[PDB]
Symmetry: D2
Subunit: 510 residues, 4 copies
């Protein structure tokens, strides 16, 4: 019995990974293909939301750094106009003992209190000496931290912060993922800065970045998707997958529709995929994986951007005076992430949690703060108090004065927020993924393949691109299996226009 639809390559999910697949499928223009998503708006976790008050919020505050020229190509194609983008410098700090320590923390001990400087420089001297002699490798994230930074910085920042964000102890995570995530501090340079009182916040791929002028980051993915042939997309309730029959290569949609595929690129969470397959073995396997949920909190506030806030981009909060691990001055990325000054809005509450002296709609201007709070079986959070707790936290960290007027609030919980690089992860993935591929199913993405090291938007996008390129041109999936390889190089070879398309164009013009 024939399926309602038959394609060579079926793409499930229209987030960055899925759209990457679609883009390369569309570029090659060889096999037939189709992309579906239960959401009417493509973008997935890289989408932007809006409060009724006109405040925009990305899903946690997303800053792009591109490792791939291909990813750049597709962005330039979607938002080609110069004024589609703003370019910014990374102003990042960590909140430690009343003071803002420039990112990364481990490289800026100099901004700490004297007593704390001691504990830190001590830990590093120890670690540098043991390292001069070490011949074994760190078994856990935690060991790596101690080995690389010493007990001083471990206890002061690394350990408490990482629990606050991963929702699992540092001793429960693996060490291989953090090539380009965590900076290994040089003893000599660190003490030199302590002596001099200088800073060093240039480490990391976040140096300088682009942000879309309108629509938040979610705008990019809407623009990218628009380059696809509408009839090959199926977004909304009509595109919600409810069943995957690996054995006879057919997917079933919510509305009963059936799609037949030769090859399946799934970008939904691999545990949901296992469920949708009714494959008991895979379900059990995926159940060995671990993830944290993410609460994204949005706070719209009236007033000119306080000088105390300055041009800070994102801030890290290791201390326990606030529930959130990171905050972003989202209003700094684009003036279109919040209403214009002329827009009149009533004050909902003051930062201290009290009623405003006036509930009349007043003018702005406005600024915006975006928060993230992790959740897991090891770190539960109370949904009905988290917004209030977050706002208090903003007070406690002197992000807001208790008098500051709050004009808009945003709170949304994303079940699958972070794929946790646990000690167990690979043992599971090295079974799950191979077994899926033996069924002609490329499971890829932040939760498709579950590898955070390679879980950024560009990474995800390329996972989709490279899956297709593997399916069609026999390309090695570098991003999936070799995070350090792709992350350590400039990937310039693959382009939105490869030789193939050039030669075909010229043969058609004769």
């Amino acid at each position: 019995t024939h399926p309602d639809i038959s394609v060579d390559v079926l793409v499930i999910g229209a987030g960055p990974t899925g759209l990457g697949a679609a883009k390369r499928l569309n570029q090659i223009d060889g096999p037939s293909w189709m992309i579906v998503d239960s959401n009417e708006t493509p973008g997935g976790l890289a989408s932007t939301d809006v409060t009724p008050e006109g405040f925009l919020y990305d899903v946690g505050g997303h800053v792009i750094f591109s490792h791939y020229k291909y990813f750049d190509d597709c962005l330039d194609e979607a938002l080609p106009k110069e004024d589609d983008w703003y370019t910014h410098q990374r102003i990042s700090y960590v909140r430690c003992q009343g003071q803002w320590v420039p990112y990364p923390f481990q490289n800026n001990i100099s901004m700490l209190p004297k007593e704390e400087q001691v504990k830190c420089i001590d830990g590093m001297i120890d670690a540098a000496l043991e390292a001069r002699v070490a011949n074994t490798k760190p078994k856990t994230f935690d060991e790596w931290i101690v080995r690389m930074m010493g007990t001083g910085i471990a206890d002061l920042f690394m350990r408490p912060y990482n629990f606050k964000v991963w929702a699992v102890p540092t001793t429960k995570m693996q060490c291989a993922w953090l090539g380009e995530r965590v900076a290994a501090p040089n003893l000599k340079a660190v003490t030199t800065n302590v002596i001099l009182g200088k800073t060093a916040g240039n480490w990391g791929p976040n140096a300088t970045f682009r942000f879309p002028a309108r629509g938040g980051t979610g705008g990019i993915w809407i623009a990218v998707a628009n380059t696809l042939p509408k009839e090959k997309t199926r977004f909304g309730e009509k595109g919600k997958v409810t069943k995957v029959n690996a054995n006879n290569k057919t997917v079933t949609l919510q509305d009963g529709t059936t799609i037949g595929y030769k090859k399946l690129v799934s970008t939904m969470a691999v545990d949901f995929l296992a469920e949708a397959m009714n494959d008991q073995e895979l379900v059990g396997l995926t159940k060995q994986l671990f993830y944290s949920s993410t609460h994204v909190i949005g706070v719209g506030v009236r007033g000119s951007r306080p000088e105390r806030i300055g041009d800070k981009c994102w801030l890290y909060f290791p201390e326990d005076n606030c529930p959130f691990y990171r905050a972003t001055i989202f209003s700094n990325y684009s003036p279109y992430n919040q209403p214009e000054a002329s827009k009149k809005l009533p004050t909902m509450q003051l930062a201290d949690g009290s009623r405003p002296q006036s509930t009349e709609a007043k003018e702005g201007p406005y600024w915006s703060i975006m928060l993230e709070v992790s959740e897991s079986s090891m770190k539960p959070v109370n949904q009905e108090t988290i917004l209030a707790d977050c706002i208090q936290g903003l007070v406690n960290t002197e992000m807001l004065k208790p008098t500051d007027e709050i004009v808009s609030t945003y709170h949304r919980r994303f079940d699958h927020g972070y794929p946790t690089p646990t000690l167990e992860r690979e043992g599971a993935l090295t079974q799950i993924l191979p077994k899926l591929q033996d069924k002609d199913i490329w499971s890829r993405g932040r939760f498709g393949s579950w590898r955070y090291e390679v879980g950024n938007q560009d990474h995800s996008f390329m996972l989709g691109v490279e899956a297709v390129d593997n399916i069609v041109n026999g390309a090695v999936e570098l991003t999936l299996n070799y995070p350090d390889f792709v992350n350590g190089r400039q990937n310039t070879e693959r382009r939105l226009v490869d030789g193939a398309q050039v030669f075909a164009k010229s043969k058609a013009q004769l």
Copy 2:
């Protein structure tokens, strides 16, 4: 003024690298292409000669170990029959002080004289203690050797042997090339074997290998070339490139024929290429490279295979009692590498150099020995004596009895034999290659790109495949730039039939 011929991609050279380009160009079947070679017979350095007496000789005794499924696919296509191949186990030894030390030498100290064992175990102990503390990297091949094996093994085997093959002292070479070439010995394992008297000759990719039943390895490349559209090839005097005009992208052949190209894949020696471009800058750059010439000496001998020879495949000769660094019992690979026993041949001489007691043509059977002797500006060789010196060497090493009857002899000198991994190499290549690429010229191959670590038949074949794959599909050239990456994995993704071809075939079906 139009050229006689115009193709999208022109391939110069039909050795493995060139043919690799061809097979993928021919597979993709997109851009137009053409392949030329000055030799009527494709195969390059991987081809086979035959003496008038019917004894075959490869260019030094070639053994195939594949790192790529794609390579395997093309061999299977060209020689699909089970009985087209022989599969063998590596029986390799090193000749040291009257005894046969199993390969690798450094892993079998137990087979040496007691006095020599001491010198070696001592060396390793020292090295192992300094390694426990070392934090810098070796600057030369020689340092690497000392660090990894100790002075004992360095002076006994490594140092003398490597000069005898590379034709340059170990102190003039770089350390980066030897990932899978030189075995780093483990002190405990080595001494445990010395105590017990056990061996360990399983290290290396050569464990089990296959070899063509007929025509030598050259038979493979003739077969592979036959799967190409004949009309797209131009082999022989008609295909000899004499001039390359990079500025207007046209090549000129010996017979005056002009060929225009959009992309050039050049597999000739990059120094010859620079010469053919009349590009002074590149000629100067290429002259900073270094290579050794290779003398291949063949000796056909009458008699049943001596038990003293046994099933030995190839043998290493570090000592100075013979000029050759290696010997291959070529007759062991295939019964068709030498005449049948029923064939009658006259004896040309005895191993000791004297005349045969009888110049009548007697029967066999026969066995065959193939020698290699290196030459360079640092190690000259006398061509008119080398054959004789080699035969004497065979006597001194007890490979031949002074009474053994020589039936056939072979000697040929190949100017460009080994691309020497000198210290200066990369300094030159990282200038030569990029500058060539800016002219849309992909120089690839054993001398096309000059990197030995990736200079085997499968490496070369792939260098060509990947050059095309980069030109057409924007694939990254992994084999060229990341030897250790391609050598350390199973490269299974690229196939002689990719999804592209499958999907196009099914689209033409309906």
Copy 3:
């Protein structure tokens, strides 16, 4: 009330330590002095017993190596005749798995079975690598052993043997005592000998030694004692100390005699001394010390010296097939340690424990074996079976054939045999000794000061000499407080005739 006798310096005990004290007191001939001992025969633990059958036995088999010229002087004086001494070369072995391994064990791995050689060479490699990097110090004897020899040699010899002798686990002992006792094996030299099959039994002060022709080592001390003025000695029941009144410096003897002293040199076991002082605090401190008792077993056997025995001097037994840790072929030291061949003796029993076939007194010649067995609260021994058990052990270790005729037997238990270098030792001694000295009591000797590293006869002799030299001439007690100092040098300065006596002699000549 005046005491019966009053001397300036009183010496309790006429072992080597006491005799040393006396000899220098007598040389200086300044302060008045006196030496007492409960034994009619001076010598203490360095005395010799005789069986009724005419078989001599030292208290464990004593071999002199002199660190002091002073010690040499007194022996030359006591036994000045050339033929008073025999000179020997140390032939020492360790009984391991049916074989005799030359001393020291850790230096002769070559003589072990192959399977065991591997275990050992492995341990040493591990330890050599850890050592290359170690920066801390060993906390226990055990740790020291591992660090210096590896787990292989530790489990095979060091750990089992050291318990067998010290009667306490190697984990319970300190590491500082073994400067010149335990050899630290060099990895390269060891493996070099395993490869070649050579030996290395020259390590240690025991190389070549001299032994008294007559009266066992006990003869020496009788002779030394005879050079003292008889009226200044009091040996026997008349010289047994029963009370020490530190407060009014008066000693009381068994026969009621009281002796007044200004300075006391006590060479009795320091725990006995505290008891004799009725000093509760010191008693409590001394009880923190630990010692092992020694069983000395003597076996006289009929027959020419078996060739299997050869010229072996002393032998170490780490295995558990015999209760003794060491055996000495005491008959080898001097022909006068056992009866002449012409002497007729009845056989008491056979080595297998059976009755002899003849109980008539037959002739010799004879040889003699001396054994040692340790006892402690951690290692009890059954006195009534130990002799039989020892004789069986001599059979199991093939020291005796079950047929060998045993002519004489000897067994005596010395309560204070070895002062155990426990972890707790120095904590107690650094209180005990100074507190005793504050009372003008120099407690010195193998059990007077309780320090094994400095507990040989010469050491003890010199402890007494230096004690007196401190009392009279303000000399620093080097042997007591700096074992490594005196052991690591040639002590040539102090002589039996110092300038003092030379100048006095010359002033009396005028």
Copy 4:
């Protein structure tokens, strides 16, 4: 032919070493002895001079830290009255870049400029990392310095200062001598101090010291000499040795007197001694030694003690703005080192070298500065200028205002000042000293035995004491051969009243 005088032991030189010998010869009161010196006043280099203006100057500013109770006893005997001594605390600083860095320099990096702190903390970090792994020993003082402090502190202080004092480059000196002279800095402690801004100037034996109320240190040795039997001393021109006839053990004095000896304790510089012996071999040997001369400069200045000067005791000057390596505020040690306030003196010059506005004799009070300048074949110094140069330096280092009134000046050059611990030293001494002893000559003292490690007054005194003790009581000369042993312990055994004298006294009481 008999000598005019005959003694058992003859002592040449009445500095601290000679007087040490005499004191013990006098205590023992056994052999006959006699001490001679070419100076009417005993003290040697530890004697005091006086300027006509009434200003005292030690030979460089001598500060006593006693390692020996014996030394203490003799000083208590010579100067028994409480008010014979002043007790002080070590206030010591190093002059670096306009600031006073508390001694030791290496432990107080915090007091440096920020740019310099970096250079130093960097060097230590490097050093600490190499030390974690080092397994060889330093071949020179310089290497020791680098290894122990880093190139930072090496270039800033150690290297320049040590040449400025030793008159030789740090690379020309040996490493063994500096157990208690140079402090090995702990990285963690140093950086902790840099961070906190704290100090640490307690390291060293100089913590708290005592100084003779009257007569400078010279008063001590005058008082000590006075305790000797006058008739056994021969000081002055009458005591000047001119010949030493080692072969018939007779010494010849200036006035022709001949002294026969049995043992000779020579404290004159061993080079002069070899000369006096007319022993060619020893002359050659002694010429292999090296020494630096010492210029002592004394500056008396009118005025109350400037607050700028404070209670500083001695100060180190590594920088090249002054010729002197050390300065002492001698006036701070005792009020009797300079005239009383009431004394009237004319101003000789101003600190700037100009004439005084008034040559009338005005009152005080006064203060005194003592400087030291080194000289050698590698570092000449111009005698006629040095005084002025030194005064200028005092100006440059802001020790003196150019207006300060200089009342008195002192300058004297001591040919033998410092025995240089050169690399060659021991190779010479280990021949010189033993060869001398085979002749019954004990050469001892700062230049008698030439070892600086053990060349302070107490060390010297004891070298003499121990020499006599070796001659008479067969005592080991610990201070001569084991500097580290004596320096690292409290030497409490040898006293001015030993048991010997006590017992002899009580024997004569009966």
